Coordinates of C-alpha atoms and ligand atoms in Angstrom, one line a residue:
Chain O
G167 CA 12.7 -1.6 -10.3
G168 CA 11.0 0.1 -6.4
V169 CA 8.4 0.6 -4.2
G170 CA 7.3 3.1 -2.2
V171 CA 4.4 3.4 0.9
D172 CA 3.9 6.0 3.4
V173 CA 1.0 6.5 5.8
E174 CA 0.3 10.5 6.7
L175 CA -2.5 11.6 9.8
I176 CA -5.2 13.6 8.1
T177 CA -4.4 16.3 10.6
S178 CA -0.3 15.8 10.3
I179 CA -1.5 18.6 8.3
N180 CA -2.1 22.5 9.2
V181 CA -3.6 23.7 6.2
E182 CA -4.1 27.4 8.2
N183 CA 0.7 27.2 8.0
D184 CA 0.8 28.5 4.8
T185 CA 4.7 28.6 5.3
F186 CA 4.8 24.4 5.9
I187 CA 2.2 24.6 2.6
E188 CA 3.9 26.8 0.4
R189 CA 7.1 25.1 1.3
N190 CA 6.4 21.3 0.3
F191 CA 3.5 22.1 -2.4
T192 CA 3.3 23.4 -6.4
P193 CA 1.5 25.9 -6.7
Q194 CA -0.8 23.7 -8.8
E195 CA -1.3 21.1 -6.6
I196 CA -2.0 23.9 -3.9
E197 CA -4.9 24.6 -5.7
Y198 CA -5.9 21.3 -6.8
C199 CA -6.5 20.6 -3.0
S200 CA -8.1 23.5 -2.0
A201 CA -10.9 23.0 -4.2
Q202 CA -11.1 19.8 -3.3
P203 CA -14.4 18.6 -0.4
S204 CA -12.6 17.9 2.5
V205 CA -8.9 20.4 1.4
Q206 CA -7.1 19.2 5.2
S207 CA -6.9 15.2 3.8
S208 CA -6.2 16.0 0.2
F209 CA -3.1 17.9 0.7
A210 CA -2.6 14.7 3.3
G211 CA -2.6 12.4 0.5
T212 CA -1.0 14.6 -1.7
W213 CA 2.1 15.2 1.6
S214 CA 1.9 10.6 1.2
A215 CA 2.7 10.8 -2.5
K216 CA 5.6 13.1 -2.1
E217 CA 7.2 10.2 0.5
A218 CA 5.7 7.0 -1.5
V219 CA 7.5 8.5 -4.8
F220 CA 10.4 9.4 -2.8
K221 CA 10.8 5.9 -1.3
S222 CA 10.6 4.4 -4.6
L223 CA 13.6 6.1 -5.9
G224 CA 15.7 3.9 -4.3
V225 CA 18.2 7.0 -3.1
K226 CA 19.4 9.4 -0.6
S227 CA 17.5 11.6 2.1
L228 CA 18.9 15.4 2.0
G229 CA 17.5 15.4 5.9
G230 CA 14.1 15.5 8.0
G231 CA 13.6 19.0 7.1
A232 CA 14.0 18.9 3.1
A233 CA 11.2 20.4 1.4
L234 CA 9.4 18.2 -1.2
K235 CA 8.4 20.4 -3.6
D236 CA 10.4 19.0 -6.6
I237 CA 8.4 16.0 -6.1
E238 CA 4.7 16.8 -7.7
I239 CA 1.7 15.0 -8.4
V240 CA -0.1 15.7 -10.9
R241 CA -3.9 14.6 -12.4
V242 CA -4.3 12.7 -15.4
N243 CA -7.9 12.1 -16.0
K244 CA -9.0 15.4 -14.0
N245 CA -8.2 13.6 -10.9
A246 CA -6.1 10.8 -10.8
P247 CA -3.0 11.0 -9.7
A248 CA 0.7 11.2 -11.9
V249 CA 4.1 12.3 -11.0
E250 CA 6.3 14.6 -12.1
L251 CA 10.2 15.2 -10.5
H252 CA 11.7 18.2 -10.6
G253 CA 15.4 19.7 -9.4
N254 CA 17.0 18.0 -7.4
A255 CA 14.6 14.9 -7.8
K256 CA 14.7 14.6 -11.1
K257 CA 18.4 14.2 -10.8
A258 CA 18.7 11.7 -8.4
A259 CA 16.1 9.6 -9.8
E260 CA 17.8 9.7 -13.2
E261 CA 21.2 8.6 -11.7
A262 CA 19.2 6.1 -10.9
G263 CA 18.3 5.2 -13.5
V264 CA 14.3 5.6 -12.8
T265 CA 12.5 6.5 -16.5
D266 CA 9.2 6.0 -14.9
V267 CA 7.0 6.5 -11.8
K268 CA 3.5 5.7 -10.6
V269 CA 1.6 7.1 -7.7
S270 CA -1.8 6.2 -6.4
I271 CA -3.7 7.6 -2.9
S272 CA -6.4 6.9 -0.9
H273 CA -7.5 8.2 2.9
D274 CA -10.0 7.3 5.7
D275 CA -10.6 8.3 9.1
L276 CA -6.8 7.3 10.5
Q277 CA -5.1 8.7 8.1
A278 CA -3.9 8.8 3.9
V279 CA -1.7 6.7 2.6
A280 CA -0.2 6.9 -0.6
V281 CA 1.9 3.7 -2.7
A282 CA 4.5 4.5 -5.9
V283 CA 5.9 2.1 -8.0
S284 CA 9.2 3.2 -10.0
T285 CA 10.4 1.4 -13.7
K286 CA 14.4 1.9 -14.5
Chain R
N157 CA 2.8 2.0 -19.2
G158 CA 2.2 0.1 -15.7
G159 CA -0.5 1.6 -13.1
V160 CA -0.8 1.5 -8.9
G161 CA -3.8 1.1 -6.5
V162 CA -4.3 2.0 -3.3
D163 CA -7.5 1.8 -1.2
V164 CA -7.5 2.4 2.4
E165 CA -11.0 1.5 3.8
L166 CA -13.5 1.6 7.8
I167 CA -14.3 -1.7 8.4
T168 CA -17.5 -0.3 9.4
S169 CA -18.0 1.0 5.9
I170 CA -19.7 -2.9 4.8
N171 CA -23.2 -3.5 6.3
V172 CA -23.4 -6.4 6.0
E173 CA -27.5 -6.1 6.0
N174 CA -27.3 -4.0 3.5
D175 CA -28.4 -7.0 1.0
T176 CA -29.1 -4.3 -1.5
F177 CA -25.1 -2.8 -1.9
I178 CA -23.6 -6.5 -1.9
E179 CA -26.2 -8.1 -4.8
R180 CA -24.8 -4.6 -6.4
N181 CA -21.5 -4.7 -5.9
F182 CA -20.3 -8.3 -5.4
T183 CA -20.4 -11.5 -7.3
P184 CA -22.2 -14.5 -5.3
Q185 CA -18.6 -16.6 -5.4
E186 CA -17.4 -12.6 -3.7
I187 CA -20.5 -12.8 -1.1
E188 CA -19.6 -16.7 -0.6
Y189 CA -16.2 -16.3 0.2
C190 CA -16.9 -13.0 2.7
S191 CA -19.7 -14.6 4.4
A192 CA -17.7 -17.7 5.3
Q193 CA -15.0 -16.2 7.0
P194 CA -14.5 -15.7 10.8
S195 CA -15.3 -12.3 10.3
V196 CA -17.4 -11.2 7.6
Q197 CA -17.5 -7.4 7.7
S198 CA -13.9 -7.3 7.5
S199 CA -13.8 -9.5 4.8
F200 CA -16.3 -7.6 2.4
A201 CA -14.3 -4.4 3.8
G202 CA -11.2 -6.3 2.0
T203 CA -12.6 -7.4 -0.5
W204 CA -14.1 -3.3 -1.3
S205 CA -10.8 -2.1 -1.1
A206 CA -9.4 -4.6 -3.3
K207 CA -12.3 -3.7 -5.9
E208 CA -11.1 0.4 -5.5
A209 CA -7.3 -0.8 -5.5
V210 CA -8.0 -2.5 -8.8
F211 CA -9.9 0.4 -10.7
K212 CA -7.1 3.6 -9.4
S213 CA -5.1 0.8 -11.2
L214 CA -6.3 0.4 -14.5
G215 CA -5.6 4.1 -15.2
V216 CA -9.6 5.2 -16.8
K217 CA -11.1 8.6 -15.5
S218 CA -14.6 5.6 -15.0
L219 CA -15.9 2.1 -15.8
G220 CA -18.3 3.1 -17.7
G221 CA -21.8 3.4 -15.9
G222 CA -22.7 3.0 -12.9
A223 CA -20.9 3.2 -10.2
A224 CA -20.8 -0.6 -9.3
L225 CA -17.7 -2.6 -8.9
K226 CA -19.3 -5.7 -9.3
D227 CA -17.4 -6.6 -12.4
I228 CA -13.7 -6.4 -11.2
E229 CA -13.9 -9.7 -9.2
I230 CA -11.4 -10.7 -6.7
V231 CA -10.7 -14.7 -6.6
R232 CA -9.5 -17.0 -4.1
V233 CA -7.9 -20.1 -3.9
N234 CA -7.2 -20.9 -0.3
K235 CA -4.1 -20.7 1.7
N236 CA -2.7 -18.9 -2.0
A237 CA -3.3 -15.2 -3.0
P238 CA -5.9 -13.0 -4.3
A239 CA -6.5 -13.2 -7.6
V240 CA -8.2 -10.4 -10.3
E241 CA -11.0 -11.2 -12.5
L242 CA -11.9 -7.9 -14.9
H243 CA -15.6 -8.7 -16.2
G244 CA -18.1 -6.4 -17.8
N245 CA -17.5 -3.0 -18.4
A246 CA -14.2 -3.6 -16.4
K247 CA -13.0 -6.0 -18.7
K248 CA -13.3 -3.9 -21.9
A249 CA -12.1 -0.5 -20.1
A250 CA -9.1 -2.5 -19.1
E251 CA -8.6 -4.0 -22.9
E252 CA -8.9 -0.7 -24.0
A253 CA -6.3 1.0 -21.7
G254 CA -4.0 -1.8 -22.7
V255 CA -4.0 -3.6 -19.2
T256 CA -3.2 -7.2 -20.0
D257 CA -2.8 -8.9 -16.3
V258 CA -3.2 -7.2 -12.4
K259 CA -2.1 -8.6 -9.0
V260 CA -3.6 -7.1 -6.1
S261 CA -3.0 -8.0 -2.3
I262 CA -5.8 -7.5 0.7
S263 CA -5.0 -6.3 5.0
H264 CA -7.3 -5.9 7.8
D265 CA -6.9 -4.5 11.4
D266 CA -9.2 -3.9 13.7
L267 CA -9.5 -0.8 12.5
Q268 CA -8.9 -0.6 9.1
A269 CA -9.0 -2.6 5.4
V270 CA -6.3 -1.7 2.7
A271 CA -6.2 -3.1 -0.5
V272 CA -2.6 -2.8 -3.5
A273 CA -3.2 -3.7 -6.9
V274 CA -0.8 -3.4 -10.0
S275 CA -1.7 -3.6 -13.7
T276 CA 0.7 -4.2 -16.5
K277 CA 0.4 -2.9 -19.9
Chain W
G185 CA 4.7 -10.5 -11.3
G186 CA 2.8 -10.3 -7.5
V187 CA 2.3 -7.9 -4.5
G188 CA 2.1 -7.6 -1.0
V189 CA 0.1 -5.2 1.5
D190 CA 0.0 -5.7 5.6
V191 CA -1.1 -3.2 8.2
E192 CA -0.6 -3.6 11.8
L193 CA -1.2 -1.6 15.1
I194 CA 1.5 -0.4 16.7
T195 CA -0.1 -2.1 19.9
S196 CA 0.1 -6.2 17.7
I197 CA 3.7 -6.2 18.4
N198 CA 4.6 -7.1 22.6
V199 CA 8.2 -6.4 22.9
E200 CA 8.6 -8.1 26.3
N201 CA 7.2 -11.1 24.2
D202 CA 11.0 -12.6 23.7
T203 CA 9.5 -15.8 22.1
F204 CA 7.7 -14.5 19.9
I205 CA 10.2 -11.7 19.0
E206 CA 13.4 -14.8 18.4
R207 CA 10.9 -16.9 16.5
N208 CA 10.3 -14.0 14.0
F209 CA 13.2 -11.8 13.5
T210 CA 16.6 -12.7 13.0
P211 CA 19.7 -11.2 15.3
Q212 CA 19.8 -8.5 12.4
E213 CA 16.8 -7.1 12.6
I214 CA 16.0 -6.8 16.5
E215 CA 19.6 -5.2 17.0
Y216 CA 18.1 -2.8 14.9
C217 CA 14.8 -2.5 15.9
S218 CA 16.1 -2.2 19.1
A219 CA 18.4 0.9 18.4
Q220 CA 15.2 3.3 16.8
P221 CA 13.7 5.5 19.1
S222 CA 10.6 4.1 18.9
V223 CA 11.6 0.8 19.6
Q224 CA 7.6 -1.5 19.2
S225 CA 6.5 0.8 15.8
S226 CA 10.3 -0.5 14.3
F227 CA 8.9 -4.1 15.0
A228 CA 5.8 -3.6 14.0
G229 CA 6.8 -2.0 10.5
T230 CA 9.5 -5.0 10.2
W231 CA 6.7 -7.4 10.9
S232 CA 4.5 -5.7 7.9
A233 CA 8.0 -5.4 6.1
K234 CA 8.0 -9.7 6.5
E235 CA 3.7 -10.3 5.8
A236 CA 4.2 -7.8 3.3
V237 CA 6.9 -9.9 1.9
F238 CA 5.0 -13.0 1.9
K239 CA 2.0 -12.2 0.4
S240 CA 4.1 -11.0 -2.6
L241 CA 5.6 -14.5 -3.4
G242 CA 2.5 -15.8 -4.7
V243 CA 3.1 -18.8 -2.9
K244 CA 1.2 -20.9 0.0
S245 CA 0.5 -19.8 3.8
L246 CA 2.5 -22.4 6.4
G247 CA -0.4 -21.2 9.0
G248 CA -1.1 -18.0 10.5
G249 CA 1.4 -19.4 13.0
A250 CA 4.3 -19.9 11.0
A251 CA 7.4 -17.9 11.7
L252 CA 9.0 -15.5 9.8
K253 CA 12.8 -15.0 10.9
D254 CA 13.6 -16.5 7.3
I255 CA 12.2 -13.4 5.4
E256 CA 14.4 -10.9 6.3
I257 CA 14.0 -7.2 6.2
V258 CA 17.9 -5.7 5.8
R259 CA 18.9 -1.8 6.3
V260 CA 22.3 -0.5 7.0
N261 CA 24.8 -0.4 4.1
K262 CA 21.4 0.1 2.4
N263 CA 19.2 3.7 1.7
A264 CA 15.5 1.6 1.3
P265 CA 14.6 -2.1 3.6
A266 CA 15.7 -4.9 1.4
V267 CA 14.8 -8.4 0.9
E268 CA 17.1 -11.1 1.8
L269 CA 14.9 -14.7 1.8
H270 CA 16.5 -17.3 3.7
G271 CA 15.5 -21.1 4.5
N272 CA 11.9 -22.3 3.5
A273 CA 11.5 -19.0 2.0
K274 CA 14.1 -18.8 -0.2
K275 CA 12.7 -22.4 -1.5
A276 CA 9.0 -21.2 -2.1
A277 CA 10.1 -18.2 -4.1
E278 CA 12.5 -20.0 -5.7
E279 CA 10.1 -22.9 -6.7
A280 CA 7.4 -19.8 -7.3
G281 CA 10.8 -17.8 -10.3
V282 CA 10.0 -15.2 -8.3
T283 CA 13.6 -13.2 -8.8
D284 CA 13.5 -9.8 -6.8
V285 CA 11.6 -8.8 -3.9
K286 CA 11.5 -4.9 -3.2
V287 CA 9.9 -3.9 0.1
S288 CA 8.6 0.0 1.6
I289 CA 7.7 0.9 4.9
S290 CA 5.6 3.3 6.9
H291 CA 5.0 4.4 10.5
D292 CA 2.5 7.1 12.0
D293 CA 1.5 6.7 15.5
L294 CA -1.5 4.7 15.6
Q295 CA -0.2 1.9 12.8
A296 CA 2.4 0.4 10.5
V297 CA 2.3 -0.2 6.7
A298 CA 4.2 -2.3 4.0
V299 CA 3.7 -2.6 0.3
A300 CA 6.4 -5.2 -1.4
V301 CA 6.6 -6.3 -5.3
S302 CA 7.8 -9.5 -6.6
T303 CA 9.5 -10.0 -10.0
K304 CA 9.2 -13.2 -11.7
Ligands
LIG522 C1 12.8 8.8 4.9 C2 11.6 9.5 5.1 C3 11.1 9.6 3.7 C4 11.3 9.0 6.3 O1 9.7 9.5 5.7 P1 8.4 9.6 7.5 O2 7.4 9.3 7.1 O3 9.4 10.3 9.0 O4 9.1 8.4 8.2 P2 8.3 6.7 7.5 O5 7.5 6.6 9.0 O6 6.7 7.0 6.4 O7 9.4 5.9 6.5 C5 10.5 5.5 7.5 C6 11.3 4.5 6.4 O8 11.3 4.6 5.7 C7 12.4 3.6 5.1 N1 13.6 4.6 4.6 C8 14.4 5.3 4.6 N2 14.8 5.5 4.2 C9 14.8 5.4 3.0 C10 15.5 5.7 2.1 N3 16.2 6.5 1.2 N4 14.3 5.2 0.3 C11 13.9 4.6 0.4 N5 13.2 4.0 1.9 C12 13.7 4.4 2.8 C13 12.7 3.3 5.7 O9 12.1 1.4 5.7 C14 11.5 3.5 7.1 O10 11.7 2.4 8.5 P3 12.0 1.3 9.0 O11 13.4 2.5 9.0 O12 11.3 0.8 10.1 O13 12.6 0.5 8.2 C15 11.9 11.4 5.3 O14 11.7 11.2 6.1 C16 12.5 11.7 4.3 O15 14.2 11.3 4.2 N6 11.5 12.0 2.8 C17 12.4 12.3 2.1 C18 13.3 14.0 2.0 C19 13.9 14.6 1.5 O16 15.2 14.0 0.9 N7 13.9 16.4 0.5 C20 14.3 17.0 -0.8 C21 13.6 16.8 -2.1 S1 13.1 15.4 -3.0
LIG523 C1 -11.8 7.3 -6.6 C2 -12.7 6.5 -6.5 C3 -12.7 5.2 -6.8 C4 -12.4 6.4 -4.5 O1 -12.8 7.8 -4.2 P1 -12.7 8.2 -2.5 O2 -14.6 7.6 -2.4 O3 -12.8 10.0 -2.2 O4 -11.3 7.3 -2.2 P2 -9.8 7.8 -1.8 O5 -9.5 8.5 -0.7 O6 -9.5 6.0 -1.5 O7 -9.3 7.4 -2.8 C5 -9.7 9.1 -3.5 C6 -8.1 9.5 -3.9 O8 -8.0 8.8 -5.3 C7 -7.4 9.0 -6.2 N1 -8.8 9.4 -7.4 C8 -8.8 9.9 -8.4 N2 -9.3 9.4 -9.1 C9 -8.7 8.4 -9.8 C10 -9.2 7.5 -11.1 N3 -10.0 7.6 -11.6 N4 -8.4 6.5 -10.7 C11 -6.8 6.0 -10.5 N5 -7.2 7.4 -9.0 C12 -8.0 8.4 -9.1 C13 -7.3 11.0 -6.0 O9 -6.1 10.7 -5.7 C14 -8.2 10.9 -4.6 O10 -7.6 11.7 -3.8 P3 -7.4 13.3 -4.3 O11 -8.2 14.1 -5.0 O12 -7.6 14.0 -2.5 O13 -5.8 13.7 -4.2 C15 -14.1 7.0 -6.4 O14 -15.4 6.3 -5.6 C16 -15.0 8.2 -6.1 O15 -13.7 9.2 -7.2 N6 -15.5 8.5 -5.3 C17 -15.9 9.3 -5.1 C18 -16.8 10.6 -4.8 C19 -17.9 10.5 -5.2 O16 -18.1 9.3 -5.0 N7 -18.6 10.9 -5.8 C20 -20.2 10.8 -6.1 C21 -21.1 11.7 -6.2 S1 -22.7 11.6 -5.5
LIG524 C1 -1.5 -15.4 5.6 C2 -1.0 -14.4 6.1 C3 -0.1 -13.3 5.0 C4 -2.4 -13.5 6.7 O1 -1.7 -12.5 7.6 P1 -2.6 -11.7 9.1 O2 -2.0 -10.8 8.8 O3 -3.2 -12.5 9.6 O4 -4.2 -11.0 8.1 P2 -4.2 -9.6 6.9 O5 -5.2 -9.1 7.1 O6 -3.1 -8.8 6.7 O7 -4.9 -10.7 5.4 C5 -5.3 -11.8 4.9 C6 -5.1 -11.3 3.7 O8 -4.1 -12.1 3.2 C7 -4.4 -12.9 1.9 N1 -4.2 -13.7 1.8 C8 -3.9 -14.8 2.3 N2 -3.7 -16.2 1.9 C9 -2.1 -15.6 1.1 C10 -1.6 -15.9 1.0 N3 -1.0 -17.1 0.6 N4 -0.7 -15.2 -0.1 C11 -0.8 -13.7 -0.8 N5 -1.8 -13.4 0.3 C12 -2.5 -13.9 0.3 C13 -5.7 -12.5 1.5 O9 -6.1 -11.8 0.8 C14 -6.3 -12.8 3.0 O10 -7.6 -11.5 3.1 P3 -9.0 -12.4 2.7 O11 -9.1 -13.4 2.9 O12 -9.8 -11.8 2.9 O13 -9.4 -12.1 0.9 C15 -0.4 -15.0 7.5 O14 -1.4 -15.4 8.1 C16 0.2 -16.2 7.7 O15 -0.2 -16.9 7.0 N6 1.5 -16.1 6.8 C17 2.3 -17.3 6.4 C18 2.8 -17.8 7.7 C19 4.3 -19.0 6.6 O16 3.7 -19.9 5.8 N7 5.7 -18.7 7.1 C20 6.8 -19.2 6.4 C21 7.4 -17.8 5.6 S1 7.7 -18.8 3.8
LIG525 CL1 13.4 20.9 -13.2
LIG526 CL1 -17.3 -11.0 -19.4
LIG527 MG1 -11.3 5.6 1.1
LIG528 MG1 -3.1 -8.3 9.9
LIG529 MG1 4.7 9.0 8.5

């Protein structure tokens, strides 16, 4: 097993910063977040989900500045978040015996938060 | 298989005066419990967060009308952990999704309430 | 199974309060938190982890004021923080059939949050 939690300030996401966004979010994630009622809040929630998922893997960090594009949040019933690992995240997870990851997201004025649980 | 849910709520998101909303979304036992706590508004907010967290963990697109959450009941046993009991549409939707169990946890501070639920299939 | 979550204001921890710190944190925890970039935030996160872990055990509370030194958060030769139960926490957990506990911690500048999941 494994568990992850992450909390983010809504203002931590600068929607105007295309470089930051493009480096850390897949085109699909960007399309989803850009279409929500509160775009900044949606990106913040997705960012929290990426971090929560990473923490649940039980692996080593590549460094404070490594992009999280490899951890992709996809949707199920249109809006519910599912996890898809790619690249290094996929390798590291498989190397750790992780067979599945579930995630949930929520936000309010204070911050966005996400919780992930992984199965081995 | 498996499922997870998290929800965060402002304490002020619950208006204890709004009897109509409370009646619609909380069971008599939930209302009785929350009404008896040191901070009533905070307790309702935590219970509300728990209902939302539990719903998100079920992996369903919605409960099947309406949006009311009375069907997801938080049961309390003094000095012990909160527990989940599903009724009505929530129970049907959960069973239809293969959910066999749901655990929940609640926390508050001055600023907000948060709950986390995990479901088993 | 069992789940626990706890959220704390960073300012809820008074680092000056040696009595509170000594009563609730092991020497190892105190050393770790005291060495972090933000000491107050680190203690707050560790406190939240203790609370989250307790909630996941599915046991009765000894009271609002009971010390939590028995629930130790270890990070070191560890990637993710890990849980080690001692004393009464260990007995109570074993008595409840808990065989393992995982925990995760997150901070922003305002608050800390932790989530724990226990296995039976
Ligand atoms: C380590 C990381 C997850 C922490 O993120 P953050 O938002 O800056 O800080 P947070 O307050 O939310 O979390 C820090 C806490 O996470 C936990 N943590 C640290 N490393 C961890 C790890 N390897 N696995 C799981 N949890 C970890 C610790 O509990 C720490 O708190 P503590 O020191 O008080 O015990 C983040 O900095 C990171 O390295 N992400 C991964 C980046 C990466 O590897 N990119 C490659 C793409 S997959
Ligand atoms: C999902 C719901 C329980 C909570 O939504 P919310 O009020 O926005 O509060 P939260 O921020 O805590 O949760 C929203 C998040 O839950 C997640 N989510 C959405 N639908 C979900 C579902 N059916 N199952 C599990 N998780 C879901 C999403 O990640 C969403 O964030 P994101 O879309 O930006 O990624 C539900 O009440 C809802 O979507 N309502 C808001 C929209 C609404 O009220 N419309 C009515 C029109 S009058
Ligand atoms: C129970 C306790 C964790 C609550 O901590 P808190 O930070 O003051 O309050 P929080 O807002 O975070 O959470 C309170 C919620 O915890 C939940 N809870 C209460 N007792 C619980 C228990 N025995 N197990 C799991 N969850 C519990 C309840 O849901 C409560 O909210 P609610 O009454 O509205 O439903 C804490 O007060 C406590 O008594 N710790 C126990 C100390 C102890 O026994 N130590 C010895 C180690 S074995
Ligand atoms: Cl890949
Ligand atoms: Cl019923
Ligand atoms: Mg909300
Ligand atoms: Mg608290
Ligand atoms: Mg953070």
